[PDB]
Design a protein around this ligand. Structure first.
Ligand SMILES: Nc1ccn([C@@H]2O[C@H](COP(=O)(O)O)[C@@H](O)[C@H]2O)c(=O)n1
Length: 206
């Protein structure tokens, strides 16, 4: 695989772990777009800025040279040389990331970073196959019910399914990229993620 593979889906749909596994199996990097949005949210929080000031947030993001490091075991984000990754998959970031992800300048910043990487790679996100790499040769979209998404997210947070589901449902209401028209759509509530990885790899290697 010498081009680009995109794997998009809603939160906790499995696109991150599937992308990491598919990429490892192909011997190419994977790019987690969400980790960049999480980093922008975490930095805006810690910086004490009003995230509605896009100009100031973008000066902060550009000034700290925030960069995505693709490592086979999992991506890392460094800001002024500091690895922020351990602070990004937390309840506070989950709860505020939507406020910065909707800012056009922040999406442009994330997309610029991603579009810098030389192919091949597997990129995962919400809109990798639609907004960022519409030319990708292999596109996949993973669907998942709110219930299985809340169950998976709860496994990785202090909160339980009951609360996570309420949170995800309110977030869903609050906003969206649909699958790309040429993406293979797979529901991760029917197939196990191990089966999804195998199925995605069989399509890529054909
Ligand atoms: N391509 C992407 C990836 C993530 N996001 C935003 O980043 C937030 C975090 O990403 P994750 O569900 O992939 O970890 C998402 O909830 C969403 O707000 C996005 O808006 N577009």
């Amino acid at each position: 695989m010498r081009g680009i593979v995109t794997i998009d889906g809603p939160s906790a749909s499995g696109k991150s772990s599937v992308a990491r596994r598919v990429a490892a199996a192909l011997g190419v990097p994977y790019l987690s777009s969400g980790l960049l949005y999480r980093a922008a949210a975490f930095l805006a929080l810690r910086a004490g800025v009003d995230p509605g000031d896009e100009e100031g947030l973008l000066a902060l993001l550009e000034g700290l040279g925030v960069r995505l490091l693709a490592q086979a075991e999992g991506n890392r984000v460094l800001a002024d040389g500091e690895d922020l990754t351990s602070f990004l998959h937390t309840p506070e970031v989950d709860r505020v990331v939507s406020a910065v992800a909707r800012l056009p300048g922040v999406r442009a910043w994330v997309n610029r970073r991603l579009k810098e990487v030389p192919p091949p790679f597997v990129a995962e996100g919400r809109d990798m196959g639609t907004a960022v790499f519409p030319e990708a040769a292999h596109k996949f979209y993973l669907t998942a019910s709110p219930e299985v998404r809340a169950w998976r997210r709860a496994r990785e947070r202090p909160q339980a399914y009951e609360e996570v589901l309420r949170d995800l449902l309110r977030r869903d209401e609050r906003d969206q990229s649909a699958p790309a028209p040429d993406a293979l759509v797979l529901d991760t509530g029917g197939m196990t993620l191990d089966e999804v990885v195998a199925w995605v790899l069989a399509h890529i290697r054909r």
